[PDB]
């Protein structure tokens with residue numbers, strides 16, 4: 001497994017736990033209603049240790065870029081400014097966000113040709129499945 005195997009455009013086809021995860025994050029209702037109903041594409045690109053992840057939908061588009069293994073300031077969809085690190089480890093992209101004494105982990109992996117995105121904060125979990133599209 002390589003980080004390059006995660007590259008491309010992926011379309012959300014299933015989500016579980018996402019509203020609960022946003023509630024744990026303390027996201028307000030206007031942002032939570034957008035996320036319950038947006039069906040974004042995720043575009044992952046990686047040039048060596050450079051990674052970009054863009055999330056696109058008519059409702060909301062976000063994008064960050066980083067160097068694998070380096071701490072950086074990520075502005076999240078809900079407007080947090082986190083210290084984030086992304087690494088490709090044990091066949092998954094692992095993203096750890098820290099802010100205000102809090103932490104959340106986001107993983108992205110290839111399973112059965114699908115992109116499986118999992119999030120957690122304080123044992124509140126979500127799983128989002130995306131299918132590879134042109």
Ligand SMILES: O=C(O)c1c(N2CCCCC2)nc2ccc(Cl)cc2c1-c1ccccc1
Nearest residue numbers: 031032035038040055057060077078106117
């Ligand atoms: O899908 C997301 O990127 C994603 C997200 N992710 C889920 C994927 C894993 C990392 C956290 N976390 C969020 C937290 C708060 C809010 Cl308001 C939106 C998101 C979105 C998001 C959803 C729809 C359109 C654009 C962005």
Ligand SMILES: O=C(O)c1c(N2CCCCC2)nc2ccc(Cl)cc2c1-c1ccccc1
Nearest residue numbers: 028029030031032033034035036037038059
């Ligand atoms: O109708 C809503 O539930 C509702 C809503 N409010 C907030 C609370 C009470 C009722 C309406 N607030 C929102 C805020 C942001 C966005 Cl993107 C959508 C909504 C919708 C909504 C609109 C269309 C389809 C489904 C839901």
